[PDB]
Structure formats: structure tokens, C-alpha cells
Amino acid sequence: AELTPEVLTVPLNSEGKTITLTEKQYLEGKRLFQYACASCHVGGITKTNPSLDLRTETLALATPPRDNIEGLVDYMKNPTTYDGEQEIAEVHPSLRSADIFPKMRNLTEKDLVAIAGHILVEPKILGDKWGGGKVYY
Amino acid sequence: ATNRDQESSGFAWWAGNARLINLSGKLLGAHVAHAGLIVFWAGAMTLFELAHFIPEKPMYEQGLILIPHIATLGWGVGPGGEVVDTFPFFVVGVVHLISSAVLGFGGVYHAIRGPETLEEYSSFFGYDWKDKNKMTTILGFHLIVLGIGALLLVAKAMFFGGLYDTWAPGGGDVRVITNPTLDPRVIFGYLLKSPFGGEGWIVSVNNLEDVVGGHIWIGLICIAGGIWHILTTPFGWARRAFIWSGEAYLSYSLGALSMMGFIATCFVWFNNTVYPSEFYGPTGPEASQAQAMTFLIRDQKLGANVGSAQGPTGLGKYLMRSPTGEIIFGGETMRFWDFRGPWLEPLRGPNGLDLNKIKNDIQPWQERRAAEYMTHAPLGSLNSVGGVATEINSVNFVSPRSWLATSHFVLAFFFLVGHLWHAGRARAAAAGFEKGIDRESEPVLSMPSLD
Amino acid sequence: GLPWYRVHTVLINDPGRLIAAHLMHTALVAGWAGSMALYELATFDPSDPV
Amino acid sequence: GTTGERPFSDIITSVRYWVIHSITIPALFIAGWLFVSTGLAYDVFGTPRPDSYYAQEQRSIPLVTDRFEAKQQVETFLEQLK
Amino acid sequence: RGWFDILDDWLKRDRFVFVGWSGILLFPCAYLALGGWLTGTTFVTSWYTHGLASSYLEGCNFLTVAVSTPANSMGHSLLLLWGPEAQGDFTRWCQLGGLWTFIALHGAFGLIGFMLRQFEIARLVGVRPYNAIAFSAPIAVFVSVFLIYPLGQSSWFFAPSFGVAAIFRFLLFFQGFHNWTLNPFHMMGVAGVLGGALLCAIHGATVENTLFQDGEGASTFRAFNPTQAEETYSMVTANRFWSQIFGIAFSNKRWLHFFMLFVPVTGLWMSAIGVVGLALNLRSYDFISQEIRAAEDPEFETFYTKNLLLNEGIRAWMAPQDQPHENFVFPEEVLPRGNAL
Amino acid sequence: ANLWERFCNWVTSTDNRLYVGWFGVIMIPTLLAATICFVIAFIAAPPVDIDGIREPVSGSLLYGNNIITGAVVPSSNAIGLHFYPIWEAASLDEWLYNGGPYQLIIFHFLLGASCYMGRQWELSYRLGMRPWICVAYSAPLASAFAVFLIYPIGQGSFSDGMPLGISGTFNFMIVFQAEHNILMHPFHQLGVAGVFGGALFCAMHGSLVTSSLIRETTETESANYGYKFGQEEETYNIVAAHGYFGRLIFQYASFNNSRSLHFFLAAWPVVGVWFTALGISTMAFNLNGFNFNHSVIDAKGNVINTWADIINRANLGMEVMHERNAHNFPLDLA
């Protein structure tokens, strides 16, 4: 197997429009997801709240939905609870809260799209391992 | 061949620095050239860290051990631990690295060109290991220098800008100390604390005032000892009690450094005052308490009454009593309830954690600290995979407290061995049998048989 | 004195006494087989070979 | 004593020695390098290249399951790959 | 003065590396087991037999490279290169696991070669062959662990693979499936090995610290002549020291060096025996009385029961990937787990 | 000679069947206390709540253990690193339930054994010996400090000390593998090299000196009767053993200085065992073994398992089952 454009094609918005990433971006998002998110989100689980993974099917039943790049860039700007009813930038790094979450300062809109690409591509590659936790290691 | 070979000195090459025992000048060169390498390393390493430093990552995520020591001293850092000015780290680096060249220059001078032995060229620097008066004089001088050096840390804290105070109000800030603690009941009460749990001997010092005051006492004490030894010679009981040789003096100091390395290992592992967790990452206990706080908060937010949730064992899932009754976090963390840190103490009442404060007064900044500290616990692999042993690759992290405590245990253990080695050798050299048993007068053969 | 682990070496140059040892050993083994078979007959249940 | 061969201390300091091995040693190194860089070792030993452990849309390993049809098994997998 | 005797002369010449008649067995098999291991770890996969990468070529490092065992479907096949399975096809031989047999069998004959070398050299020089006898324990271990154990099991799959992390896998497998730490033959083996390291260290240190003064310098090594009648340290002072420190002390130097041979050699032999038991799953797995009481008394817990809970977790969590030919599928819900973890 | 001096001379007397010494003045009482407490506890102590969750573990024979399964059980995790002398408890019944005997034994034992080391130095000084046997003993002493003191300190509880039992020792080894991946740690690999090679060299030296014993007996008596205690001459021909062993490998792989040969035997295992003791001491602070889990991935990014991933599956089996009632939150951080 290898890394192909069919694999690097991910939803851009919820209307169906996709975008097709490149090797260089996917690696950038893995590198930036490490720097920024892996401390709590390593492997697609969430250590400080295991009930909530980055599985593509979880990001689908999110409100607003999150299984596309725009939905994710928006989470990373202004994050919410799963039902959308609260903003949690106070306890979840985002551009909004980049003063209290320094690692978010030096990120640019292209960085955030790298990171979401990664998140949406990675389960195409690993499947159940991504968001499964230690059962699947 | 002034020693410098095995046949004249009696020492092989693999024990060659022992050819220096009675070459005071060449020996001075080796100490100063070695002093050279230390100051060099302080310099090179600080620069490396600075060149590799990203102000927007926590220090503890970047493998920094020396910059956190400069930050602890109040240079380059502001409220919360935030880095504001990197220049002082640069300065500290360069000044050491530049200084190392003069040490090296004069150490190499003395080891080669200079007089191999100082005793003809000058009666002040020359010495003889056996001159108990001259040896205490050097001791006393060096004591004085150290009492001065401890007073430099007081100067920094009281006059020249203060110290990073993790306990400071509003989440931590650099602070001038002006009422150091001099009450010796406090200062030496630390020396009499048990080293066991909940007391911690001097690793327990938890406030800069006690720290500064103890450096006023140590500095003055060290200055009186300097003078005392310069003006005194050793008493009869001390004469009869020790061995007076170069190697014995070495073995005594190796003993002392060993002891010190062991204490430093526990200082860096347990103490979050002079090793602030903002710069060094949380302590082991602190991360483990922080996990319990994290899921107290999460579950309480969903509507759990955390004070009455009975866990599987019958003990409280979030809160239980310690053996003396204090309210503490439940689960394995129960062993860590002695933990104390600025992010948790606000919820502490007189009986321990206060349920009302837990129900009502947890601020987002504490939720954040506790999530941060829990996800940066000092666990990781030797190739810097962060996590428990069973974690997959992703997080490149080992806590600076793991690095500093592991390295200094190893060193302390090996210097205790050095102590036993040179101690027993010094004893047997002075008594005259370090090269073996004399066939002509083997002591055992003059002893009565055991049975 | 012979060490305990060498005592049977007194038969090396004694062919008659080595036969004697070898016969006693044979007697022990046949004795065992006869003994084992009797213990097994006295406890074997033949009522169900299935 | 001495069994008769030339002393090693004398050979690796001789010039003749280094004249010979300042070629042979590097040459053998390049050959090993070339063995891998040509991708020729993958082919001799049957070791997958990064792109040929799995087919694009399968996550099951090609384990052999029969003793005598086993060489026939392995070849089947290598073709369910192009 | 025949050709046989001429060939004997030359094989037994004093050279840098003695050859002997045993060299004809020893050097070929030892060199080939070796080179086969080197070749497999550098270049050869375990992808088709185990579902694993195992070479430098695949990106393994020295800890995780291995010549892995053949697939379970091969049973106990010799896996001869010219055999039914690989049919002379070298490449398919490597992918099927041939290098494992190649190294197991060649090295087994290499070891024979080495013991016969010990006898050959012992004999030409004039010494009692006690070194050869001591090497029986390494051979005993090689045979029981690499040959006997898997002949008792379904196939060579379950032998040890030749690698550093592969052996560690073997260790844990034995814990989880055989409860090998509880086996009295391993306990004796542990006692023989730890006891031999102890005797090593204490004899070494004792002699170094009862030496006589035989030169006038501080490096005491240069004061020994290989051709001196004198004992170089004092048995008498050594004996006094240990009698007073520990209560007893050796007093006979022959006994002492026999003891050093006897202890580790006997430990390894004892552990061989236990492994031959485990070839059959004839394990010291349980204590029946404990299980009978534990089954009936929920409040009864010992370290023995705790450890079987740990064994049970090893078996269920490692089997699917460790025995891929079984196609074990364990849903999350049947996985044994304590609270929270 | 007055009272103190007659005593001082008795204490340091080299004529006592067992040397006493100043180190022995401490070692004797502390070892006695530990040995008496250990024996009574092993036979008769009631169950101990090792993990602090009110779930006692039976360790003594009278409560249904045998030699293999019995132990002095470590003190309760609720106690963490607090000192728990008898006088700190409300009743011996409380001290037993919470595992007080483990503290008493290990403290007296570690103190007693440190002075054993010291007493080895001391007697060597009175005997006119070289002093460094005690340096060799320091390898096993540190090893014991590592499992009984250091590892508890790093993890914050004596409940995670090594148990004083045969099966408890295995429990401790298993949990350690799960939490630190010790097999994958180089210092423990050094300790295996320490003890395999110490056993290897111990057979080699025994086998080789035994091989080159000089005929001095007949075929019927034990060869041991050809050494006489105190004899000046050596009983074996080291030239001959070098001659055997130089040829077995080659001439320079083999020692011909008896002094060099014995220092090597001392040094090899002592060093190796220093390193494994240090490995336990440093994994006390969670600097763990190499982690190569998912280190190999293919062009697409599937995980390509190595043998390290297989270890990790077993590790995970250990992780999730151990102390099955003691974790309420998902990371086991100490």
C-alpha cells in the first residue's frame, strides 16, 4: 500500500465538497498534531476525557459536525461541547484562547488545515486503531 | 621522566592521575583545567538550550535543565513563568563559556609549563597532605568562599531583583524577599524533620522566605568555619580519629558528594518550590493528584456528587480520608496526599479538601493546570517516548525531573563506591599493606586458631 | 577411602561380582514389573472399555 | 611462544597493508551499499518494500496456512498486489 | 606413514587458530549459523510467517531484529532448501522460515563441534577434560529450549526466534502460558546461575584482597610470574576472614574450584529438565489446594492468585498477534481487565 | 586498661569466632530484630491490606500459604511513604492489618546489611588485608536497596516495594515489566550479561583449574585430598590451563596472569549487577525501557509490528489486570 490522493481526499465542508491534500501537508499535520494535540489526543483518544475520540464517526454526530476540514478549523478557532451548547476555549486550546495556550500563537490558517487533514486522513490509514485506545495498540 | 611512567611512580597508566599525588603544581593544573571543563559545559549547554528554545513551548517540553535554573533566580521570566526576555540566558551562557578559556589556559599552564611542585617556589601555595595546619587553612579559605557564594543568592533575592516564586499570588511571579526567616527554630527545625512521608526533612521547604533565611545562616556559618579552621589546628581526638593523606581527604569528599547527590535526587523529584513545576514539569505526585482532580471536575460537571460516590472497593471514588482523617483524592493517588502545590491549595480547608470549595470555587486556571500536569507526568521511555511503558509513539517527552533525578542517583551511587574504594585504600596505605600481605610476617599466622 | 560417588568401582576388575550386581539389578526390575502389574490389577476397573 | 604467522601489530602498520586495504575495504563498502541501493536485496531475499506489505485496501497479513502449497500461497499474494 | 596420519599431522599443527579433526565439524557449522543469523537480521522478513518485520532492511534496530521461526503450518519440517516446501527456491526458503532451521541445525552441529574440540585439545595437551564436561550444560540448554520444546508443541513456530526482543517475547509467553516462574526446575536453575555469578564475584574479590606483596609498586598485577610455584594469595588469611565474617570458609582449593564448575553447570541442567516438562505442557501451573479454597472463599487472596490474574491478562492480550495462524478474534467485551485500565 | 578499653578490645578482637566490630555492634541487633520479626510474620501474620483498598492479602503459612506462596506482605498504600513504627499504631491488630512488619523488617534489614558491608571492611583492616571485598558486596547491597527503598521512594509507596516472598517477588517482576518495560532497558540487559557471564566464567574457572590439577592422589581417593590447607605451592598447572585454553580459542584470548584473571572474575559480575541495580533505581523515577511500539510503518502508514509490539501486547495484559480494584482513573501514573 502507499499514500495516495484517494486517501488524501477529505471532506472540505458538510455539503460534500472535498479537497485533496498532498504528502507534504499530511506530514505537516502529523508534525503539528504532535506539537499541539498529541499530549491529550495521541492516537485519536482523549486522555483527559476518554469518552470523546477523534473518530470520524464521532466528529459526524458532533454539533456542529466536525468530520470535515471547515468544521475542524472552526473547532480549533472556537471550540464547543459535543452538542454545541457551550464554548470551551477557556479549557481547550484554540486561537481564541492562544494567550493561555501559547503553542497556539505561532499557528496560521494553513497550519490548522494541515492538522485537520491529518485527523481526517489518519483513520483511513489505521482504521479502528485510531480512537480505539490500548485494545488496538 | 618525572614520574610519568609506571616504573618510577609505581602506578600503571590506567591509574595515572595517581602519579600526581605529590606534585602539587601539576595537580593544581589538573584541578583548574577540570574546573575549566565544568564552566565550559555550563556555557556551551546554556547556549545550546537557548538556540533550541521556543518561548511558546513549556520549558519541560524541550529538554531544558539549565535555563530553568536561571528562570528560578528571577531572570528572563514574568508572571506565570512566561518567558519575557531571553537575553539574560544568553549572557549567563557566554560569560561562563568565555571564563572557561582562562581556567583552561591557566590549568594547562600549570599542568605543563609551570613548576611541577609548588613547595620551593612559594611557601603559601605549597602544601603537604600531612600538614594538618596547612590543610585546615585551605579548608577554611574554601569555606569562606562558599559562605560568600551562599550570600550571593541572598543578594539576588533581597537586593538584586528577587526570585521566581511559584507560590506567589495570581499564579506565580518574580518577587523580592524582604523578611527572610532567621528564627533558627524554623531554619534548623527542617534539619530535625523526619525524612519519611509527610515530613520530608529539608526537601519540604516550601516558601522562598525559609529558603533565603537558610542561606543567610549557611553563609555566616561557613564564614565562621573558614575563620575557625584558618586560626585553629585539629584537636587530639580529631587527630586520633582520622587518616591524614591525600587519598583519605579525597574519600571524605567523595562520601560528602555522594550524600549530596542523593539529596538533590529527592529535591528535584518531590519539591516544587525551588524546582517550580512551571519550568520543570510536575512532580510525580503532582501529576497523579492532578489526574484525580481532572476527573473529579469532569464527572462533577456531568452532575456527579463526588463526595458521596462510593467506589468499587467501598472507598470513595474521588474523595476519601487519609489515615489521620484529612480529605484527599481517592484511588492510587491516596499515597500522594502529602502533595502541596499552588494550583490545589485554594481548595484546601482545615479538614483537607473542602467539598464546598470543590462544588463551587474551581477556576478554569486550575482545570487547565491539572489537565496540563496530568498529561506531562514524569513517565517516559529512554528514547523519549512520553507515557507509560505501554504507550505508542507520538509524544517526544521525558520530564526534566526524570532526567535530573536519574542522572544524579547514578552519580551519587558511584561516588559512594568511590568513597569505599579510596577510604579503605587510604586506611591500608597508611597502615602499610595496600600492595598485599608480607609473606615474612603474615599477621594471621601469629594469631591463635579460631577452633 | 573411596568417595561415596565411587563405591561401585570395586566391581571393575571383578567379573563375577559384576554379574552378581547385574543379576540383582535384573531381579529388581522384574520384581518391579511384577509388583506394578499386581497393583494395577488390584485397582483396574474393567467394566467399561468405552 | 610464537606459532609462526606474521605479528598483527606489524601488518596493520606496514605500508603494503594499507596500500591494499585502502581500496578493498572501501570497495566492499560500496558493494554493500549498492546491494541495497539498487533494491537488489529486496529481490534476492523476498523482503517487502514499504509499498508492498499490504494491498491498498486490505489490512490482513499474507500468512501461509498450508505446508506443501506454501510456496504457491506466497506467490498468490505477491500478484494480488499489482 | 599413510595418508590418514599425514592429514592428522596438518590438522593438529600448532597454528594461530587450531583446527583439529573437530574443526571439520566446528568451523563450517559455527560460521554458517552465525552468517545465517547476520544475513537474516540484516535482510530477511518475518512478514509471511509471523506478520512481523524483523530486519535492518525493514527498519528494525538491533533489539528488534530476529531470524523468526517458521510458520505454524510447517509443523516440524526440517525445511530443507531442496525440500517439498521451498523446492530449491532460495528466496521462498527465506520467506518461509528456512533460515531458522538453517541456524538451529547448523548451530546444533557447531556445538558438538565445540565440545569435541574441547576433548581434542584437552587430549593433545594432557589435561583432564573438565572444561568439556562443563560445556554439557550449554548444550543441554540449547537442545531442550530450541529443539525439544517445539517438538513437543504444534510446530517450530513456538520455539524461540533468534533475536533480542524475540527472546523477551519468549520469556513473557512462558510466564503467561506455562507459569514458568513457579516451576521448581527453573528455581534451581536461577539458584545455579545467580549462585555462580556470586561465586565468580566472591572468589575474584577474595583473591585480589588476600594477595601477598610480591613487587614494590602499587599496581599489583605485575607481581605475578606465570611460572612460579608459590600461591599468589594467602588461602590461610582468606579462610580466617570468611570464617569470622560468614561463619564458614573454604579450606580446600580443589574443592573450591570444583564447586565453581558444579554450581552453574547443575543449575542449567535442572532448568533443561523443566523445559522438557514444558514441551508437554507438563507445567507447575497451579496449587490445587489454593484454587479449591479460592474458588469457595472470595476473601482469600495470596500472591499466587494475583499472579494468575496477570497470566490470564498476558494470554488474552497477546495471543491474537502472537499466534496469528489461530485467527483469534476477541471482542473488547471478553478481554479481562481490572477497573479503569 | 580500664572498662572502656577492655570492651573496645573485645569488640575489635580478631580472636572471636565471629568478628564483632563497631559495624557489628549495629548489625547484630538490627539483623536479629529483622530475622525474628520476619520468621514470626511469615508463619503467623494475619492478612495485610497491601493496596490500601481494604482488600487484605494473606501471606503467612497459618493462613493457608505454603513456602512458595507465602510472604511478608508490604505495608498499605494508604501509608505511602509515612513511617509506621509499632508505637504509631493504636493496637498491634492495627499495625498487622496495615502491614507494619514489612517496614520494621526492611528498615532493620537494610541497616543491618549496610553494616555487614562495613564489617567486611573492618575485619580486613584488622587482618592486614586489602579492603575491597566490601566493594564487591556493594553490588548485591545496592540491588536490595533498589527494590526495598529506592523504588518505593520514586513511586511514593512501600506498597510498591518488593514483597518478602517467593511468589511476591514474581508479582513484583511482572508489574515492573508492565510499567517500565525493563526487558527493553539496557541496564537490565547489562545485569543479565552480568549474571550469565558470571556463571559462565565461574564454570570456566572451575572447569579449567580442575582440569589442570597436578596428580597427587590415586584413582580411589578424592582428588580434593591432593590440596593441603596452607600449602605453599599451587595445586594446579596454570601454564597447562593457559595452554589448553589459549588453543581452544587463541593464545591472547587467554589469561596467563593469575592476578589479572581473578580481578576479571570479580569485576565482571559486580559491574553488571551495579548496572541492573541502577536500572531499578532509575526506573524508580520512570525513566523506562526503550519504546519501539509502532516504530515501523509502511508507505501508506499501516503499522508493521515488530517483536517489540508483541512484548507490548503482553505488557498490556499485565497492565490492565494488575491490582484490578485499585485504579479509578485511566492512567496508572505511579
Ligand code: CLA
Ligand atoms: C566542608 C566543611 C567542613 C569540613 C570538612 C570540616 C572538617 C573539620 N572540622 Mg570544621 N567546621 C565547618 C566546616 C567543615 N569542617 C564549619 C562551617 C564550621 C562552623 C560551624 C566548623 C566548625 C568546627 C569546630 C568547632 C571543630 C571543627 C573540627 C573539624 C575537624 C574534625 C571533623 C569531625 O570530627 O567531623 C565530624 C565528626 C564527628 C565525630 C563529630 C560528631 C558528628 C555527628 C555524629 C554528626 C551530627 C552532628 C552535626 C555536626 C550537627 C547536627 C546535624 C543534624 C541536624 C543532621 C575537621 C578537620 C574540630 C576540630 O578539630 O577543631 C579544629 C572542631 O572541634 N570544625
Ligand code: CLA
Ligand atoms: C579531566 C581529565 C584529566 C586531567 C585534567 C588530567 C591531567 C593530568 N594528567 Mg591524567 N589522565 C586522565 C584524565 C585527566 N588527566 C585520563 C582519563 C587518563 C587515562 C588515560 C589519564 C592518564 C594519565 C597518565 C598515565 C598520566 C597523567 C598525567 C597527567 C598530568 C600531566 C599530563 C602530561 O604531562 O601530559 C603532557 C601532554 C601533552 C603535552 C599533550 C597535550 C596536552 C594538552 C593539555 C592538550 C589539550 C590542549 C587544550 C585544548 C588546551 C588549550 C586551550 C587554550 C585556550 C589554553 C596532568 C596534570 C601524567 C602525570 O601524572 O605526570 C606525573 C601521567 O603520566 N594522566
Ligand code: CLA
Ligand atoms: C585556585 C586557583 C589557582 C591557584 C591557587 C594558583 C596559584 C598559583 N599560580 Mg596560577 N593560575 C590560575 C589559578 C590558580 N593559580 C588561573 C586560573 C590562571 C589563568 C588565569 C593562572 C595562571 C598562572 C600563571 C601564568 C602563573 C601562575 C602562578 C601561580 C603561583 C603564583 C601566585 C600568584 O600569581 O599570585 C598573584 C595573585 C594575585 C595578583 C591576586 C589577584 C589574582 C586574581 C585577580 C584574584 C581574583 C579572585 C576572584 C575574585 C575569585 C573568583 C574567581 C572566579 C570564580 C570568577 C601560584 C602557585 C605563577 C607561577 O607558577 O610562576 C611560575 C605564574 O607565572 N598562575
Ligand code: CLA
Ligand atoms: C548403565 C548405567 C550406568 C552405569 C552402570 C554406571 C556406573 C558407574 N558410574 Mg556413571 N552415570 C550414568 C549411568 C551409569 N553409570 C548416568 C546416566 C550418569 C549421568 C546422570 C552417570 C554419571 C556418573 C558420574 C558423575 C560418576 C559416575 C560414576 C560411576 C561409577 C560409580 C557409580 C557409583 O558408585 O555411584 C554410587 C551411587 C550411589 C551410592 C547413590 C546415588 C543415588 C542416585 C543419585 C539416586 C538413586 C537412583 C534410584 C534408585 C533410581 C534409579 C534410576 C533408574 C530408574 C535409571 C560406576 C562405574 C562415578 C565415577 O566415575 O567413578 C569413578 C562418577 O564420578 N557416573
Ligand code: CLA
Ligand atoms: C560439517 C559441515 C556441515 C554439516 C554437518 C552440515 C549439516 C547440515 N546442513 Mg550445511 N552446509 C555446509 C556444511 C555442513 N552442513 C557447507 C559447507 C555449506 C555451504 C555449501 C552448507 C550449506 C547448506 C545449505 C544450503 C543447507 C544445509 C543444510 C544442512 C542440513 C542437512 C544436510 C543433509 O541433508 O545432507 C544430506 C547429505 C549427506 C548426509 C551426505 C552423505 C553423502 C554420502 C553419499 C553418504 C554415504 C557414503 C557411502 C555410502 C560410503 C562412503 C564411505 C567412505 C569411507 C568410502 C544439516 C543441518 C540444509 C539446512 O540447514 O536446512 C534446514 C540446507 O538447506 N547446508
Ligand SMILES: CC1=C(/C=C/C(C)=C/C=C/C(C)=C/C=C/C=C(C)/C=C/C=C(C)/C=C/C2=C(C)CCCC2(C)C)C(C)(C)CCC1
Ligand atoms: C591538562 C591535560 C588534559 C586536560 C585538558 C583540559 C581539561 C583542558 C580544558 C580546556 C579549556 C577549559 C579550554 C577552554 C577553551 C575555551 C574556548 C576557546 C572558548 C572560546 C570562546 C569563544 C570563541 C566564544 C565565541 C562565541 C561567542 C562569544 C558568542 C556566540 C558565538 C560563540 C559561542 C562562538 C588532558 C586530559 C587532555 C591530557 C593531559 C593534560
Ligand SMILES: CC1=C(/C=C/C(C)=C/C=C/C(C)=C/C=C/C=C(C)/C=C/C=C(C)/C=C/C2=C(C)CCCC2(C)C)C(C)(C)CCC1
Ligand atoms: C540552606 C537552607 C536551609 C538550611 C540548611 C542548614 C542549616 C543546613 C545544616 C546542615 C548541617 C549542619 C549538616 C550537618 C552535617 C553533619 C554531618 C554530615 C557529619 C558527618 C560526620 C561524620 C561523617 C562522622 C564520621 C565518624 C564517626 C561517626 C565516628 C568516628 C569516625 C568518623 C569521624 C569517621 C533550609 C533547609 C532551611 C532551607 C533551604 C536552604
Ligand SMILES: CC1=C(/C=C/C(C)=C/C=C/C(C)=C/C=C/C=C(C)/C=C/C=C(C)/C=C/C2=C(C)CCCC2(C)C)C(C)(C)CCC1
Ligand atoms: C546464510 C546462508 C549462507 C551463508 C551466509 C554467510 C556465510 C554469511 C556471512 C555473514 C557475515 C560474515 C556477516 C557479518 C556481518 C557483520 C556485521 C553486520 C557487523 C556489524 C558490527 C558492528 C555493528 C559492530 C560495531 C561495534 C558496536 C556495535 C559496539 C562496540 C563497538 C563495535 C565497533 C565493535 C549460504 C551462502 C551458505 C547459503 C545459505 C544461506
Ligand SMILES: [Cl-]
Ligand atoms: Cl498485581
Ligand SMILES: [Cl-]
Ligand atoms: Cl486511580
Ligand SMILES: [Fe+2]
Ligand atoms: Fe581461582
